[PDB]
């Protein structure tokens, strides 16, 4: 569970800071949620939780619902947020975010 990996309190506060549509800043989210104090192995564990269909990649649908991954109470990302995140994250251009790509997003926060 996400709350097994990260602190519910940290999650609450990170979600709480990006309540308005278009306010998402992945670096600051990653920082607040506690993903910057996690080992690479824990990072990968988070990734697997986010990859809803276990395809090994975070596709557009899972990307839009990334916050729901952390707390089912969270909003979906707006269109500009999804577009912006995919663009920061997709280095090989397949339109998806793989494990390494996700790890890099986190590491650069
Ligand atoms: Ca997937
Ligand atoms: Ca990719």
UniProtKB/Swiss-Prot annotation:
| EF-hand domain location | 38-73, 77-109
Q: What would be one Gene Ontology cellular-component term for the protein?
A: stereocilium
Q: Which GO terms of the molecular function aspect are on file?
A: calcium ion binding; identical protein binding; protein-containing complex binding
Give the UniProt record's GO annotations in the biological process aspect: cochlea development; excitatory chemical synaptic transmission; gene expression; inhibitory chemical synaptic transmission
Q: Which UniProt keywords apply?
A: Acetylation, Calcium, Metal-binding, Muscle protein, Phosphoprotein, Repeat
Using the record's annotations, give every residue carrying the modification N-acetylserine: 1
Q: InterPro entries recorded for this chain?
A: EF-hand-dom_pair (IPR011992), EF_Hand_1_Ca_BS (IPR018247), EF_hand_dom (IPR002048), Parvalbumin (IPR008080)
Q: Name the positions where Ca(2+) 2 binds.
A: 90, 92, 94, 96, 101
Q: According to its UniProt record, what is one Pfam family this protein matches? A: EF-hand_7
Q: Give residues where Phosphoserine occurs.
A: 1, 7, 23, 65
Tell me which SMART domains the record gives.
EFh (SM00054)
- Disulfide pattern: none
Which parts of the sequence bind Ca(2+) 1? 51, 53, 55, 57, 59, 62
PANTHER family listed in its UniProt record: PARVALBUMIN ALPHA (PTHR11653:SF2)
Q: What is known of its domains?
A: AB domain, comprising of helices A and B, is involved in structural stabilization, protecting the hydrophobic core of the protein. It is required for high-affinity binding of Ca(2+) and for Mg(2+)-binding.
| Function, in words | In muscle, parvalbumin is thought to be involved in relaxation after contraction. It binds two calcium ions.
Q: Which family does it belong to?
A: Belongs to the parvalbumin family.
Name by which UniProt lists this protein: Parvalbumin alpha
The protein's organism comes out as Rattus norvegicus
Q: What is the lineage of its organism?
A: Eukaryota, Metazoa, Chordata, Craniata, Vertebrata
Q: Which gene encodes it?
A: Pvalb
